[PDB]
């Protein structure tokens, strides 16, 4: 009676992607981003944008028939920060508030055993 999905959330510095899919992950059920629910580029990464996108995806999720999901949060990873930012947290909260049962939470950020050089250079970046 309980059908499970996978809510893949990607929280970047400049935007948050909320994606729900089948257990295999190949079928997309609904994809909504921070830019979807906002007017200004500066507010794409805002938690408020994430909450609206989460609410949007949740409505479609119920519409299709999926009632539970397994959340796989991740960040940019690679040569950049590994921890999901506030936006993914807000989206994760929104899904819980949406009423969809949350199956399992995991962090699947790309962690490189070895990585190429970063964009900043020797003197750094992120002034």
């Amino acid at each position: 009676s309980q059908v499970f999905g996978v809510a893949r959330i990607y929280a970047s510095f400049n935007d948050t992607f909320v994606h729900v899919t089948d257990l295999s992950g190949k079928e997309t059920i609904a994809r909504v981003t921070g830019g979807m629910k906002v007017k200004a580029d500066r507010d794409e990464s805002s938690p408020y944008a994430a909450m609206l996108a989460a609410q949007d995806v949740a409505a479609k999720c119920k519409e299709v028939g999926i009632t539970a999901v397994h959340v796989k949060i991740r960040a940019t990873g690679g040569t950049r920060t590994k921890t999901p930012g506030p936006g993914g947290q807000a989206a994760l909260r929104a899904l819980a508030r949406s009423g969809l049962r949350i199956g399992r939470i995991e962090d699947v950020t790309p962690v490189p055993s070895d990585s190429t050089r970063k964009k900043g250079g020797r003197r750094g970046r992120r002034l």
């Binding site: 009676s1 119920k62 519409e63 028939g65």
Partner: protein, 159 residues
Amino acid sequence: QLLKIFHLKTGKVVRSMKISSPSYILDADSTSTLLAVGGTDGSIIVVDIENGYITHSFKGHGGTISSLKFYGQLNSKIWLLASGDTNGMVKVWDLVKRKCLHTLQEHTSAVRGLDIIEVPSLNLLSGGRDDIINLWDFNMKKKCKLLKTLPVNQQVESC
């Protein structure tokens, strides 16, 4: 998940009630007084339109309700409700006795088309997305037999 009854002549929302789960299937009897609600949780809610109260609450289906068919006539007591879910399961609920009278399973895909006609004994036409049509014959007693299965070559959205 809020059912709202709107009166055209009066032009206002006469009744508002809450349902258990989202319902994408709505059927109104030919006599224009009963409404059957098919939720994705397999529950069936029958509401009196003029009065606005729940008359029947049938909860037998496991899959999502995909088709609902009211059978009845003015000045008769053979009133019936036919419900088909997405599991190819069809049940003939009896309103007067408030019980499930028959259960059918031959359909494999979702049942989208239901229709009952009176045989001058009652005949049920069940059609689903499995591209077949099943003709059943039945009565108020424990008699429910399959007569014919027609391969219609087309996905049966309604029949």
